[PDB]
Design a protein around this ligand. Sequence first.
Ligand SMILES: [Ca+2]
Length: 279
Amino acid sequence: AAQTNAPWGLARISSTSPGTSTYYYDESAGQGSCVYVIDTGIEASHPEFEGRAQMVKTYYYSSRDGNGHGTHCAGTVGSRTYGVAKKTQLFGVKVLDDNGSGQYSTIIAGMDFVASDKNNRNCPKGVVASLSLGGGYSSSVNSAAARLQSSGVMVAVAAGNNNADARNYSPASEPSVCTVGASDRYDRRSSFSNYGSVLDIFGPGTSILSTWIGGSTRSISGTSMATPHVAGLAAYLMTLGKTTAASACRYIADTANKGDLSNIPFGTVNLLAYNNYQA
Ligand SMILES: [Ca+2]
């Protein structure tokens, strides 16, 4: 399939070169997979989700996304226009309030929730979780992410927006999950993107157009935006049968565009998420 005039990040993920505008992908499009977006929620009513999104959990007085950030991330995973995996099922877990903040204890509860909740969902092709959040180093937060991964979920987490080594942030620093840095449309490391040995992969993160609340759309930037490209890619690849939850981060790294990003610090992977789709 070909989507013309796609957001640059979608075009980038299916291209051996920057500077193109058509997204190419297998029509299966993540059908039969599921992606949890652990964030401020998802506006499930947004036409862009086509009934494929739903809220499954909140820790606050509402499951509504009163911020937009979760809706944006979910859009990059699986919206019809702005998404990588256009037929995946999206499940929202609201661990962040409408200010985009969340106590680590609530975030941890949300991760353990997903590990159990997948057993209540139909995801024959596999399960992914996208965590566009983080804070300072916490062994408990890392351990929760590790459990989620161990339970059979492909966990993708944001590296962070500190232009610093991600070893000092969680869940970014957890070795067993897929830690995602951000790049821009000219294949530069995004200026805010964290880096370091704990990174596994980069994805498009600067000036990313996606869904927003009130049935709208918005371009924003962050490792929060790169993460759902990788989560959606994992779901897409799992539907194709190319990989599994336990191996998807490795597979994505194995098949990534290599050595093409600029301003990658010595010791950080130079790998850009790529679907290796040949039309
Ligand atoms: Ca690893």
